[PDB]
Design an enzyme around this catalytic site. Sequence first.
Site, PDB file in Angstrom:
ATOM      1  N   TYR A  55      14.256  46.793  39.991  1.00 39.90           N
ATOM      2  CA  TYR A  55      14.708  47.128  38.636  1.00 39.90           C
ATOM      3  C   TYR A  55      15.083  48.617  38.567  1.00 39.90           C
ATOM      4  CZ  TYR A  55      14.334  47.132  33.421  1.00 39.90           C
ATOM      5  OH  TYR A  55      14.536  47.350  32.081  1.00 39.90           O
ATOM      6  N   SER A 128      10.151  44.893  45.062  1.00 40.28           N
ATOM      7  CA  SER A 128       9.809  44.917  43.652  1.00 40.28           C
ATOM      8  C   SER A 128      10.385  43.665  43.014  1.00 40.28           C
ATOM      9  CB  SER A 128      10.226  46.240  43.031  1.00 40.28           C
ATOM     10  OG  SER A 128       9.868  46.282  41.653  1.00 40.28           O
ATOM     11  N   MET A 129      11.181  43.747  41.956  1.00 36.20           N
ATOM     12  CA  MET A 129      11.829  42.554  41.407  1.00 36.20           C
ATOM     13  C   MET A 129      12.660  41.845  42.459  1.00 36.20           C
ATOM     14  SD  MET A 129      13.103  43.098  37.623  1.00 36.20           S
ATOM     15  CE  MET A 129      12.056  43.451  36.216  1.00 36.20           C
ATOM     16  N   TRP A 153       7.206  41.863  42.806  1.00 38.16           N
ATOM     17  CA  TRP A 153       6.916  41.788  41.382  1.00 38.16           C
ATOM     18  C   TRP A 153       7.527  40.492  40.873  1.00 38.16           C
ATOM     19  CZ3 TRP A 153       9.335  40.841  36.806  1.00 38.16           C
ATOM     20  CH2 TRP A 153       8.733  41.271  35.628  1.00 38.16           C
ATOM     21  N   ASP A 174      -0.652  49.949  43.773  1.00 36.76           N
ATOM     22  CA  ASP A 174       0.558  49.720  42.988  1.00 36.76           C
ATOM     23  C   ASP A 174       0.172  49.609  41.512  1.00 36.76           C
ATOM     24  OD1 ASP A 174       2.976  48.623  41.992  1.00 36.76           O
ATOM     25  OD2 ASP A 174       3.354  47.583  43.936  1.00 36.76           O
ATOM     26  N   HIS A 205       3.952  51.910  44.273  1.00 37.12           N
ATOM     27  CA  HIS A 205       4.906  50.801  44.282  1.00 37.12           C
ATOM     28  C   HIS A 205       6.090  51.014  45.225  1.00 37.12           C
ATOM     29  CE1 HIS A 205       6.810  47.289  42.600  1.00 37.12           C
ATOM     30  NE2 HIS A 205       7.809  47.940  42.021  1.00 37.12           N
TER      31      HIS A 205
END
Length: 256
Positions: A55, A128-129, A153, A174, A205
Amino acid sequence: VQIGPAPTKASLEASRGPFTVATTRLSANGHGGGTIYYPTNAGAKVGVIAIVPGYLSYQSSIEWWGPRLASHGFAVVTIDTLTIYDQPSSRSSQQLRALDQVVALGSKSTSPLYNKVDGSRTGVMGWSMGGGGSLISAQNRPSIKAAAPQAPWNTTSNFSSLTVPTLIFACQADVVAPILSHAVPFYNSMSRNPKQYLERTAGDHFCFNNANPTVGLKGVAWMKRFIDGDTRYTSFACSNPNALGFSSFRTERCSL
């Protein structure tokens, strides 16, 4: 298939593998465009890995993997997304499109990738995303041969259907995707697949975004073992790396 020389800990920790790395652009078509990293001298066709950022982030957040993996014998596409706000399911769709499009360039006589790629062997990575997106890709397209998301994520954690060999890189400290609600539940949900969990001590993260040697060893070894079926990499792929700086290691259905 067995491409390249017999691996060693030193050769997998090194900044580059044996092959020289070229790039060519992937035009934006259902994603934000990308760079395709590929070996010039692999001596045989190579599999394809698609990597997607997080993101608010761009290709640069995942770029180090491009040359690293390509230099060991993979065509690696690092994409931008349609928008920086895209959620995991959209990132998965974009990742799958990038895989398919790179494969198609391998059959285009005007492409630098002509005759260099094997679309029967593919993998997914992302941060992540984009790490959630990679788990989604593996869930939705089980013909993928391997997945290795980092600091993943996702708002849900039911990845129990996965049959794809999956390595999760997790960042212990994270705050964005805390491991007790994201990485660890994702890992625990899986029962049908070779799987691995490697956690970086005190990592934030972004802890996998900057070329750690053990992370590089593991990502290449996992992709060699499961994309290529190269059993010379079973010990590197399946073993605890016994490395400084890692707080947890777990693996299942990854024998020898």
